[PDB]
Amino acid sequence: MDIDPYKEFGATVELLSFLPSDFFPSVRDLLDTASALYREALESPEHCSPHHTALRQAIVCWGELMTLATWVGVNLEDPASRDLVVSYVNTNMGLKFRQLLWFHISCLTFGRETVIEYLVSFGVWIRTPPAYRPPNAPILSTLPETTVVRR
Amino acid sequence: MDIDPYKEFGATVELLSFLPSDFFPSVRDLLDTASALYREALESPEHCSPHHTALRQAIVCWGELMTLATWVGVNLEDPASRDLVVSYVNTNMGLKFRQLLWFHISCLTFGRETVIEYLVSFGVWIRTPPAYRPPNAPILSTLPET
Amino acid sequence: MDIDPYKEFGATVELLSFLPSDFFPSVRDLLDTASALYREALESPEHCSPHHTALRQAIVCWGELMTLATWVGVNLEDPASRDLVVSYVNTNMGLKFRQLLWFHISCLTFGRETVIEYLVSFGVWIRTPPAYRPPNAPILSTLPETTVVRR
Amino acid sequence: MDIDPYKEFGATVELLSFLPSDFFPSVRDLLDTASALYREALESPEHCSPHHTALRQAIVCWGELMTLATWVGVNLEDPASRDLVVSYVNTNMGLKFRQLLWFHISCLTFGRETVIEYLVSFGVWIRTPPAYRPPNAPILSTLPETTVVRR
Amino acid sequence: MDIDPYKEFGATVELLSFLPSDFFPSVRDLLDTASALYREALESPEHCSPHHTALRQAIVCWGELMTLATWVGVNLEDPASRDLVVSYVNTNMGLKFRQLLWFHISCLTFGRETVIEYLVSFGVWIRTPPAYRPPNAPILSTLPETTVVRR
Amino acid sequence: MDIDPYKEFGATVELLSFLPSDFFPSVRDLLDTASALYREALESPEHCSPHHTALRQAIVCWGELMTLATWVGVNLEDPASRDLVVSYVNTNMGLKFRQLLWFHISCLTFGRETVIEYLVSFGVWIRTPPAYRPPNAPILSTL
């Protein structure tokens, strides 16, 4: 079909194509952020929000893909094809999962309006040619880059 | 007829020449930004804005220019002239379209007054000597302060 | 994308396919009608109407295409390919511009309802086989074909 | 100085450029019509209307042009060049004066709005290919379509 | 006659004498800034403000100076003396016109009080020895110190 | 740009083309008139009038030209080139500067409408053929 898992939330696959391919953190770092900020709500028995539902589903499917990787590394004798499949699962399927994770963790941490405005502004930034581009790329944050809160 | 594509919007061809010619993103990146942000409005059977009207027209005209370039590639046998024509369509007309798409997408995203003050300020900045101007190049951003 | 520059106004590319390919006036005649009826409004600094916006954009792009034609006629040494490109720009791209011009000038002069009704009626006329087709094709006009207004 | 003699009245040299060369009566017939419809007003010491002012001026410059033609015919001994200049004066300048006289006589007879809509509709008719238009040009006249003066 | 072109506006040739020679954009950049910020007001038939009057006059005298430079380059056969005069016109008189254009464009952009306090503070900064002053000259700009145009 | 320095003051360059090139007094005479009539107001720190602003600007741009001329006469060793360029500075730019000074001093002294009617009347006088042209050329005066 044509689900396009972001258009339900307000972004699209092409709106997230503003961000380059290597912009997204690693799958380990994104799973660490998830378990560090929303573990007790991702394990609760209630529909907390659509982001929580989609994030639970994403994590279960990555778990199914990591079980696949373990199984193939255990069961395939041909090492060339074995490492081929494992590297494919880890990188080429991993990129789609990291784009999915980044989006959900960031839209939970900062908000839909903030994440969409950040996507637009980072599109502007990465579009602007290098010679006329400021060094301060836009970034998501809840505090100013320097925070003078003495006590 | 001596028509400005920007005079009704409050800009001018010389006001968009006030920025470096290589400041504007590629036509590919700008068409991607348009289809990523306002596709459902650039395909609806409503006007919704002079910017949507002008942006629909601009994209149709670029599609016609790209069909021209494909036709040239297929139907010109002389490679020198063929690649000269294609390079012209991609660089001169491509620069004019990138200046046009940038203006309309940026206006729709940020605001007419915001984009005009940005044009003026970035033009003044790129001309101020380096030691007496803020060090970071100006940029447009929807992300507020925290 | 799928802009279809008429569906914003109420027609479509297929509704304007009722009219044959050679029905549309020349680009020179349509630019003359434009500069004879709406020049002071096409050069004004205000959004007069969506037809005016689209017509300004169309005229600027035809100007860009005529600058292309001048450039190629000046810069291409190979005469065969030069005249090939110039004839292409003038006829095959010209037809699309004349369909665009005719539509906008007529919808400004006569009105959207009148232009759409004319498209439907000319579809009926040009569809009817020649033997059962009246000689009076439908035409757009603000006066009767004969106008007895003595003084 | 690039002056349009109709722009003052609402027409345009590009709006009257559609009426074919054979559309206008001869200079003699248009002068007879002027002197038989508005002689007592084109010979009065009163500012009657802009059409009267322009008609007076046009007739004076045609008188000067006819004096020119007579002088050429009398004083150019070369018959070839003499007939060349006479033909030029009687056809090119003659057509311009026929277009100018027709416009003013017809404005005075019918009305500004009437003659302008007539020019518009005749442009629409003369731009259509001969195969898609009613075969009888639109007519501007004071007579009924039956041409029977009752009462 | 010992006229101060800024004393009328509140500055003084001795108040602008502190801004170094490298502080001002080139004549070309300052003319581009003028013609891109206030062209429709520097070309209007209206007395807009003393800054507009002085800007019009300054630009006319620079036009005369550029005509002089072109005439020198064309008509002085001696290359040494020709380049000598051209260098003089482009550097000395050029610096005076850069100082004059900067002052008027900056007044029109920012304000009399703002540009005067800026000149005062820049004088304080440029008079201090390099060892007792903050290393970054004071800046007059419309951009935020972050140079990110939001809203 | 097409700034046209007289447009704001109500004239145009083609209106001042009514007066010939050899009609305007020397720049010396015009500067003498200025320093005799409006020195205390051109040296004042006040926007007295747009004519005062334009006249201050013109006087400063002429002072810069004269400094250029002196600098050239001192520093250019080639006498031919030096005399050529100083003669250019004195005549070809002095012409436009005495046009500007004439316009502004005359407007200040007599009035905008008076100077404009003078320009129109001088157009009439210089267009009239010589056989029907009075020997008394038009002249500006408040007497």
Residue numbers in the entry:
A (entry chain D), C (entry chain D), D (entry chain B), E (entry chain B): 1 to 151
B (entry chain C): 1 to 146
F (entry chain A): 1 to 143
Give passages from the manuscript.
The inner shell is an icosahedral capsid formed by 240 copies of hepatitis B core protein (HBc). The N-terminal domain of HBc is mainly α-helical and assembles into dimers, which form protruding spikes at the capsid surface. Peptides based on the hexapeptide “LLGRMK” block the interaction between capsids and L-HBs and inhibit virion formation.
Structures of the low-secretion variants HBc-P5T and HBc-L60V have not been reported previously and were determined for the first time in this study. Both variants formed icosahedral capsids with protruding spikes and adjacent holes. The overall resolutions were 3.2 Å with B-factors of 139 Å² (P5T-HBc) and 158 Å² (L60V-HBc), respectively. The maps of P5T-HBc and L60V-HBc were almost indistinguishable from WT maps (local cross-correlation > 0.9) except at regions close to the mutated residues (local correlation < 0.9). Here, L60V-HBc showed somewhat larger differences, which affected the spikes surrounding the 5-fold symmetry axes (AB spikes) more than those surrounding the 3-fold symmetry axes (CD spikes). Next, we built models into the maps of L60V-HBc and P5T-HBc. Based on the density observed in the EM-map, almost 50% of all F97 side chains must have adopted this alternate conformation. The alternate orientation of F97 in L60V-HBc increases the adjacent hydrophobic pocket similar to the smaller side-chain in F97L-HBc does, which also points away from the dimer axis. However, local cross-correlation maps and DSC indicate that the mutations P5T and L60V impact differently on the capsid properties: While the mutation P5T weakens the stability of the whole capsids (lowest TM), but leaves the spikes unchanged (high local correlation), L60V stabilizes the capsid slightly (largest TM) and changes the spike around the pocket (lower local correlation).
